Amino acid sequence: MFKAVLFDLNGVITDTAEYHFRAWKALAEEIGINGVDRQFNEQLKGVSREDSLQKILDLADKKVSAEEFKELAKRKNDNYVKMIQDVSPADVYPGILQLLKDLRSNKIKIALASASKNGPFLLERMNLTGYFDAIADPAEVAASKPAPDIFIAAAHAVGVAPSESIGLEDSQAGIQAIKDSGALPIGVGRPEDLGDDIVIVPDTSHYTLEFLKEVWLQ
């Protein structure tokens, strides 16, 4: 049976993918780039802060100075950090708290495989930190999503092979990262966005321990 579950945070544990989208869209429009809509944002989910900005600049073939690049990423993060101050345990997505409880009861390791440097703060806001056996530090990996490194690091941090792990993701980049780590992906969202070749559930209430074991077995 699987021995760890490797969690993405934004769009899996809580609805903060929505806030990343709103903040990036606001930033893009400030610099005169209007193409950051929900469809384009599927290319931004899972991607690091700097890679997100670069993808936005690329969309418009725009070049900025190194100084302006750093300022823009900082501006977006400062705004996003303000947006999330009132996140609370009430914001935890359906099913997720009970999943964490059930995993712990069954001695299955729990690791965070998030790209977000705001991850630890968000787990604290939601009173979830105590459920996690490890948080992979995204500043320490040599390569970010869709590279598998963050999922490999998360598995290794809890003493489990990726091949004995399930990864939970809402993003195209993250699904690819899980695939290339050796872990089994289960996505949450639309197959139109995430593909028809892995198990995809429509909402996080489907993430029960009962449902994960069967995927591993099949």
Ligand SMILES: O=P(O)(O)OC[C@H]1O[C@@H](O)[C@H](O)[C@@H](O)[C@@H]1O
């Ligand atoms: O800017 P942060 O908080 O470090 O987050 C990095 C990335 O974290 C990922 O989890 C999100 O899906 C991305 O949208 C985000 O860019």
Ligand code: ALF
């Ligand atoms: F949405 Al994440 F790492 F939390 F890609």
Ligand SMILES: [Mg+2]
């Ligand atoms: Mg996500």
Ligand SMILES: [Mg+2]
């Ligand atoms: Mg703890």
Ligand code: NA
């Ligand atoms: Na708290």
